[PDB]
Amino acid sequence: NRMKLMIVGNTGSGKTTLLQQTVGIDVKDWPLVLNVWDFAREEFYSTHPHFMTQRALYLAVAMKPWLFNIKARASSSPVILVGTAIRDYHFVLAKLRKTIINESLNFKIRDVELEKIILSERKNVPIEFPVIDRKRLLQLVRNELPHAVHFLNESGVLLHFQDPALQLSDLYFVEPKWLCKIMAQILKGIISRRDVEKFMSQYFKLLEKFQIALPIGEEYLLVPSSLSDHRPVIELPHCENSEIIIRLYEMPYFPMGFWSRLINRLLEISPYMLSGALRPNRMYWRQGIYLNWSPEAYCLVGSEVESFLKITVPSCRKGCILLGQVVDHIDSLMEEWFPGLLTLLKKWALYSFNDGEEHQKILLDDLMKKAEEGDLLVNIPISQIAPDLILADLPRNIMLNNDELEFEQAPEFLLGDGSFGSVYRAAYEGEEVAVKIFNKHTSLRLLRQELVVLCHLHHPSLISLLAAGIRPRMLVMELASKGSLDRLLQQDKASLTRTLQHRIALHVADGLRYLHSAMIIYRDLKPHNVLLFTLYPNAAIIAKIADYGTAQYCCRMGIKTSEGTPGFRAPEVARGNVIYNQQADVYSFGLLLYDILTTGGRIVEGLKFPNEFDELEGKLPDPVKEYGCAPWPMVEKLIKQCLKENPQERPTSAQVFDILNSAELVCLTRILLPKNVIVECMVASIWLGCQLSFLILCLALVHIVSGTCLYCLLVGTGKLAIPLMCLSESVMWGGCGTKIFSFSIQKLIETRTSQLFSYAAFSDSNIITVVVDTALYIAKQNSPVVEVWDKKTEKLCGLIDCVHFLREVYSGRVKTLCLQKNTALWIGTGGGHILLLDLSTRRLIRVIYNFCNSVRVMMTAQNVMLVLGYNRIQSCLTVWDINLPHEVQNLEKHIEVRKELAEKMR
Ligand SMILES: C[C@@H]1CN(c2cc(-c3n[nH]c4ccc(OC5(C)CC5)cc34)ncn2)C[C@H](C)O1
Ligand SMILES: Nc1nc2c(ncn2[C@@H]2O[C@H](COP(=O)(O)OP(=O)(O)O)[C@@H](O)[C@H]2O)c(=O)[nH]1
Ligand SMILES: [Mg+2]
């Protein structure tokens, strides 16, 4: 019986006095318990075009923007007019009171659970500054919580803004009267944070999310709702008809919150309107913005006096560019936030044949019709009246020379089905290209959106444009030499090597990072939209992103409309009620990486079992167990991170690219052991010691002898038998006590000569391992320094310090050594770090961090590299691909090569 009453109207009308029978939304209670929200001069309109819900009854008190917001938020809701989908219209007392009760009772018919306990708990809890965090103990004391909180929010008990692009999900506003008085008392109109602070970290963030206090600079807040109600005297550098371009936007009324929204949109993009980054001059009068880069490049967006919106730009190249980008941004803003004007909106293009005569206007649709069969207006080119219809504002190097195009559009020339078009195989300028054709009932808006994406962003991981036209309305971009990723996943499963699919993932992550850095949300990532140019893993370009027909500007305000293919979209996008940030793209990339790791897998199952693919996406199986793929540790972890319900828990695209940009990720191949099971030695199925295990001082695989050291059959205690602790063959050598010894006793190299260099304690220590190579690498107990000696001279050659490398990049004390045939040295420090040194140049290739807490024993098997470590107790067994140093070098070189391309494509 909890009904919501919202008395909306124009200030003064005496609607507050109407109920009794100015500083923000009020609230009262009436007995059928009625929750009344009494709304309130005109500054609050852009502050609360939000608090309408759906389960409420409206009482309008001839303002039409109010009705426009009502019919756009709560479509099915009674609206009773009172004098001083309309259901009744009364005039002014008690007779209308019965109508309200009758309408409220009929509204429930025209339009229970464990709620009532959480409702009471949230209502009966008083705190100062009432908003509270995720206080789960209040429900613990007394998969269904976000389904009850939503109902309570839609009932007036509290407000929970769970929209991803608000960052207010964690905190819960109690007794929502307070949030309608502290958020609406901040309001010539350029006040600073210092003054606000004298009346707060989340408070400033909360204000800007509601279009109340925009950030125009440090310690500065724009506060659009408080700007002057009249424009100053602007005298533009050009006043002749032939020198300016004018376009009007005629509306029945300005939507509630339209101008603050437009100002926010325009001031965020102004640095990048010419280049795509120099700041212009800006002015504000609450119904317009003046941008000014020069007397030749400016932009005046205002509102003449119904409800027209004028855009004035100079009639030059930079003026046309600014006009095009302002029109595109206004159209995008209207599509995102004001659906209902798209017809309630009329667009006029102003033109004149001779200078000095009155301006006459033509409807933009008629002008587009005339431009579809010509580029001149017959009683004065169209490029001077509406340059954006013929793409005259875009760069001239991407204009379609229709005489150089050999395009068939045959069913056998099809390449794929785009978002709103169809890509075909064609030839342009004597080259193999791909042409996208929009299907019959499309407008210039889709072309212009995909051109916004394709024209100003150049990245080695984004599809490149070659030409664009309007008469056939195509997009010639380029031909991917190897097709889409879906075809590779479902047909050519054999060519997908590990190092190739890692590059495929990395190139898509890099493209997403760049797309997000330019305030663009892709909104649909799938193997179909990922294009492959080569299957050679060492190439710089392996994967690109195409089909930008669903991409849209995603500024700090977010995006509301829902786009994306079922099964490749974030969970917050499937339920098209919240407004989401660019983390949906991160979730889509997580799904795509899951697909890459599992190859066909869930895609093959979804083409077999539809309408369950999208339902399973809120939990999906383990990649390894479900489809039997080879384990890819630290990539399954990234998949789990990217496949999280909370968008804020998900990493950003830059973080995903950073995680993927590591050779530890690709060369890792990690097996944990039971808790409190310590391992001393292992041999290669793998045999382990402790008690002899399988998956005691020494072991050996004799083609299993169990013991200080043992080789497949020499035994060392320090009495050797065909304290001694070292023996290796590469000739066979060894080490006894604190001196190196050899035999084919052949060469007793007593090693206390090195006491002069380094500490004597490190010099005179028991030997741990000896390595046989052109040189002699020796490390001792608790020795952060590895000694290098020459067999030919039986003399020291030089000492290397692991502590030096560790500090340059941490126990540092050497525990084990292993030599790789590619001239790389593996050293296991006392901590959980691994050092890769080139044997020749003595240079640090890379240090392995976050691996473990301590390294015990290290060896190689078959070709992989076995490292055993502790976690001080828990011991872990880790398998590293033995191509790790070369992979580090190749990955860093590849990153540099394709990074010097991103700064050259611009
Ligand atoms: C196998 C065959 C298939 N092929 C392609 C090419 C493409 C392609 N190229 N360029 C494009 C630009 C855009 C584009 O928009 C998509 C993603 C909407 C389909 C596709 C392509 N997409 C699939 N297959 C190229 C030939 C050589 O190989
Ligand atoms: N005498 C009289 N005063 C009215 C009438 N309607 C409105 N008012 C005046 O309008 C004021 C109410 O303003 P109100 O509409 O509640 O402001 P709002 O809540 O911010 O929209 C009261 O002070 C009344 O004096 C009316 O029919 N008769
Ligand atoms: Mg009032």
Residue numbers in the entry: 1333 to 1353, 1368 to 1377, 1388 to 1396, 1398 to 1418, 1430 to 1452, 1481 to 1488, 1497 to 1515, 1528 to 1558, ...
Excerpt from the paper describing this PDB structure:
Mutations in leucine-rich repeat kinase 2 (LRRK2) are one of the most common drivers of the familial form of Parkinson’s disease (PD) (1–3) and are also associated with increased risk for the sporadic form of PD. LRRK2 is a large, 2527-residue multidomain protein. Its N-terminal half is composed of armadillo (ARM), ankyrin (ANK), and leucine-rich (LRR) repeat domains, while its C-terminal half contains two catalytic domains, a guanosine triphosphatase (GTPase) (Ras of complex or ROC) and a Ser/Thr kinase, as well as two architectural domains, a C-terminal of ROC (COR) between the GTPase and the kinase and a WD40 domain at the end. We present cryo-EM structures of LRRK2RCKW, WT, and carrying the PD-linked mutations G2019S and I2020T, bound to the LRRK2-specific type I inhibitor MLi-2 or the broad-spectrum type II inhibitor GZD-824.
We chose the I2020T mutation because of the different properties exhibited by G2019S and I2020T despite affecting neighboring residues. Although the three structures—WT, G2019S, and I2020T—were very similar, two features were unique to LRRK2RCKW(G2019S):MLi-2. The second was an unexplained density we observed in the LRRK2RCKW(WT):MLi-2 and LRRK2RCKW(I2020T):MLi-2 cryo-EM maps, but not in that of LRRK2RCKW(G2019S):MLi-2. This additional density in WT and I2020T could accommodate an alternative rotamer for H1998, which closes the binding site around MLi-2. The cryo-EM maps of WT and I2020T showed density that could be accounted for by two different rotamers of H1998, while G2019S could only accommodate one. One of the rotamers in WT and I2020T, the one absent in G2019S, contributed to a larger MLi-2–binding interface that closed around the inhibitor. Next, we compared the kinase domains to see whether this difference in global conformation reflected differences in the states of the kinases themselves between LRRK2 and LRRK2RCKW. This was the case for MLi-2: While our structure of LRRK2RCKW(I2020T):MLi-2 showed an active-like, DYG “in”, αC “in” conformation with an ordered activation loop, the kinase in LRRK2(I2020T):MLi-2 had its αC in an “out” conformation and a disordered activation loop. As expected, the type I inhibitor MLi-2 led to a more closed kinase conformation in LRRK2 than the type II GZD-824 (left); the ROC domain in the MLi-2 structure is shifted toward the kinase by 3.4 Å as measured by the distance between the M1335 residues. This difference increased to 5.8 Å in LRRK2RCKW, where the N-terminal repeats are absent (right).
